[PDB]
Write a protein that binds this ligand. Structure first.
Ligand code: FE
Ligand code: FE
Ligand code: FE
Ligand code: FE
Ligand code: HG
Ligand code: HG
Ligand code: HG
Ligand code: HG
Ligand code: HG
Ligand code: HG
Ligand code: HG
Ligand code: HG
Ligand code: HG
Ligand code: HG
Ligand code: HG
Ligand code: HG
Ligand code: HG
Ligand code: HG
Ligand code: HG
Lengths: 340, 340
C-alpha cells in the first residue's frame, strides 16, 4: 500500500525514479538526478503574477478583430485553458503516488503548481476581454472540437491512476473482484506510466507550442499584446516542463534507472511513435476548425501544419523516436522572437 | 471512477467542497466560497526564497552553543522537517482526488506547495549549520522519539487514501475482494475525511506552533537569527493554512455545504475532541526527550506543557469544541513579538 511517510530508512540516492519505496524525508542537499533540483530552482526563479500584466487594451483589439479572427483567438485560448486545467492537477494525482526519489517528487509538485498559475493567467486574460467569462469557460467542457483531445489526454492519466490504485490495494497477482478476475502486473503498470509520460511529453512539447504560434501571430501584428506578454511567461515555463519529461523518458529508456522499463519501452516503441503522431495529427485537424471561416495574416492551415511537423520531428528525435515527417527548417522563424 | 477531466458540464458553484463531481475547468473568476480564492491570493503574495536568507552566522552560533542547547535546537528542527515532508505531499495525494470545487482544489495545491518551500527552507538551514546533513535527515526517519510524537499523522492520511481508492474503484456497496467482504460506505469515507481534516487542523495549528516557540526561544537570546527570519516566514504561511482548515471544518459543520457532513460533524464530536487531547499529550511527552540533557532559561518542560494547553484551548474553541484544559494566560507572551 501507499504511505505518506515510509518508516524504513533508505538510501534515496539508490532508489529508481518510480515504483521504489515511497519518499519519506524531503531533503534537497543531494540528488540522484541533479537535473530535477536544477529545474525546481529555475521554476521557482520564474514565478510571476498574471494579474500584474496590463491586458486592458486587449479588450478593444479583440472587439475590433474580424469575426473569424475572434474565433481563432478564443478557440485557441479555450484549448490552452483546458490543457492547463488538466496539467495543474494531473501530474500530482498520477505521479505523486509512484515517485521514490525526493527531487522528482518536489519537481512534479513545482511543475504542477506553475501550471495552476498558468490557469490563473488565462482567467485574468478572459475576464479582461469578454463581458461574461462564463460563456467562455462553459464552452470548454462541451466544445466538440476541443474535447477531441482532452479525452485522449485524460484517458492516459485516468488509466494509469486506476491501475495504480489496484496495485497499491492488491499488489501483483491474479485477483477476483465481484465475480471477475482482475490481473495486476507491475510490468503493465510500468508500461502505462511510460505511455502516460510520453503523452504528457507531447502535450508539453507540441500541443502547447502549436497554440503559442497562434497567439504570437496576433502579437506580430501588434494585437492582443497583453495576452502575448502572459504567453511569453507561460512558454518560458513549458520549456522547463518539457526538459523534465524528456529527462524522465530518456533515463527510463536507457536502462540506467530501471532495466525493466528500458525493456518495456523498447517493446512499445511503435506504440509511442503512433501516440506521438496521433497528437500531431490532432493538432493538424484543429487547424481546419480554426481556419474554417478564413485565416489571418502570418497564419493559415498550411503554415500551421508545417510548424507542427517541424516541431514534432524535433521532439520525437529528442526522446529516441523515428522522424515521422520530412525534415525542413523552421517555417515561422519569427516565432523565435517570442520563445526561449 | 476518478477522472482528471470530467466531461459533464456542471455548475461548480453548486458542488459540495468534497465528494461531488471531479473538477474539470480551473477557473478563478467566481467561487462558491471566496475565502479560498482570498487564501490563494494571500499565499501567492507571501512567496519567498529560503536560500536568499543568510544563515552563515547561524553556523557559528550553533557550534558555540552549549551541547544540550544544540540537542534542543536540532531535535526541534528535525521534527519540523518531518512535518513539512509530510505536509508537502499529503494534502495533494489525500485531498485532491476528493475535491469538487475549483477554488478549493487550487488552494490545496498552493497550500501543499508552500509546505515544500518550508522543506527547502529547512534543508538550507540544516546544510548550513551541520557538517553532515545525512546524519540529521536519516535520524528523522529512525528517531523513535520523533516518530512517537508524530504517531497518527501518516496513519490517518494512509487510511483515507486506501478507502478513497476502494471508493473510486468499486463504488458504494458491499463487495467481495479475493474472497473477503469489503464494505465501501460513502458516509464512512466522509467521516474519515472529516477526521483527517480535524487532524491536519491540529497539526497546522498546534504542532507547528509549539515548535516555533522552541525556535524563537533562541531568537530571544540573539542567537540563530537566520533560522528566526525563516521561521517567521514559515509561521506566516501556517497562519493561512490553519485559517483554511478552520474554515473548511466550520463550513462543513454549518450544514450550508453537504448536509450529511453537518450530521457527521455532530456524530463524531467526541472523536474530534479526542484527537486534540491525544495530540496535546504527544506534544507534551516530547518534552522528556527535548530536555533530557537539560533545559534553558525560559524554556523547559513545565513552560512547554503550559504553552501546549494554552494554544490547544484556543484552537479547539475556534472550531467549536469544548476546552479540555484549565483556562490560562499566555505563558510565553514574548512569542507574540515573533509571530504576525
Ligand atoms: Fe502551463
Ligand atoms: Fe507545462
Ligand atoms: Fe509548513
Ligand atoms: Fe502548513
Ligand atoms: Hg498521461
Ligand atoms: Hg502522465
Ligand atoms: Hg492565431
Ligand atoms: Hg498555430
Ligand atoms: Hg511506448
Ligand atoms: Hg508516444
Ligand atoms: Hg501537419
Ligand atoms: Hg504539413
Ligand atoms: Hg489526516
Ligand atoms: Hg487530511
Ligand atoms: Hg517549545
Ligand atoms: Hg462520525
Ligand atoms: Hg469529528
Ligand atoms: Hg467536530
Ligand atoms: Hg501544563
Amino acid at each position: 500500500a501507499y504511505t505518506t511517510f515510509s518508516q524504513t530508512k533508505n538510501d534515496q540516492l539508490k532508489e529508481p525514479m518510480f515504483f521504489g519505496q515511497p519518499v519519506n524525508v524531503a531533503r534537497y542537499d543531494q540528488q540522484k538526478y541533479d537535473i530535477f533540483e536544477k529545474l525546481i530552482e529555475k521554476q521557482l526563479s520564474f514565478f510571476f503574477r498574471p494579474e500584474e500584466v496590463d491586458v486592458s487594451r486587449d479588450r478593444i483589439d479583440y472587439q475590433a478583430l474580424p469575426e473569424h479572427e475572434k474565433h481563432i483567438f478564443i478557440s485557441n485560448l479555450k484549448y490552452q485553458t483546458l490543457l492547463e486545467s488538466i496539467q495543474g492537477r494531473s501530474p500530482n494525482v498520477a505521479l505523486l503516488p509512484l515517485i521514490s526519489i525526493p527531487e522528482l517528487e518536489t519537481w512534479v509538485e513545482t511543475w504542477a503548481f506553475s501550471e495552476t498559475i498558468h490557469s490563473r493567467s488565462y482567467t485574468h486574460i478572459i475576464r479582461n476581454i469578454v463581458n461574461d467569462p462564463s460563456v467562455v469557460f462553459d464552452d470548454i467542457v462541451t466544445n466538440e472540437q476541443i474535447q477531441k483531445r482532452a479525452e485522449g489526454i485524460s484517458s492516459y492519466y485516468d488509466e494509469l491512476i486506476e491501475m495504480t490504485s489496484y496495485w497499491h490495494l492488491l499488489g501483483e497477482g491474479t485477483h477476483t473482484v465481484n465475480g471477475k478476475t482482475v490481473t495486476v502486473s507491475l510490468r503493465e503498470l510500468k508500461k502505462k506510466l511510460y505511455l502516460c509520460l510520453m503523452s504528457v511529453n507531447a502535450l508539453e512539447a507540441i500541443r502547447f507550442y502549436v497554440s503559442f504560434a497562434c497567439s504570437f501571430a496576433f502579437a506580430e501584428r501588434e494585437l492582443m499584446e497583453g495576452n502575448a506578454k502572459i504567453i511569453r511567461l507561460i512558454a518560458r515555463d513549458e520549456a522547463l516542463h518539457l526538459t523534465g519529461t524528456q529527462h524522465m523518458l530518456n533515463l527510463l529508456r536507457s536502462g540506467a534507472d530501471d532495466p525493466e522499463m528500458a525493456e518495456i519501452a523498447e517493446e512499445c516503441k511503435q506504440e509511442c511513435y503512433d501516440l506521438f503522431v496521433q497528437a500531431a495529427q490532432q493538432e493538424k485537424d484543429w487547424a481546419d476548425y480554426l481556419f474554417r471561416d478564413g485565416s489571418m495574416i502570418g497564419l493559415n492551415k498550411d503554415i500551421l501544419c508545417q510548424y507542427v511537423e517541424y516541431i514534432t520531428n524535433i521532439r520525437m528525435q529528442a526522446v529516441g523516436l523515428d522522424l515521422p515527417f520530412n525534415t525542413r527548417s523552421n517555417p515561422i522563424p519569427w516565432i523565435n522572437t517570442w520563445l526561449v
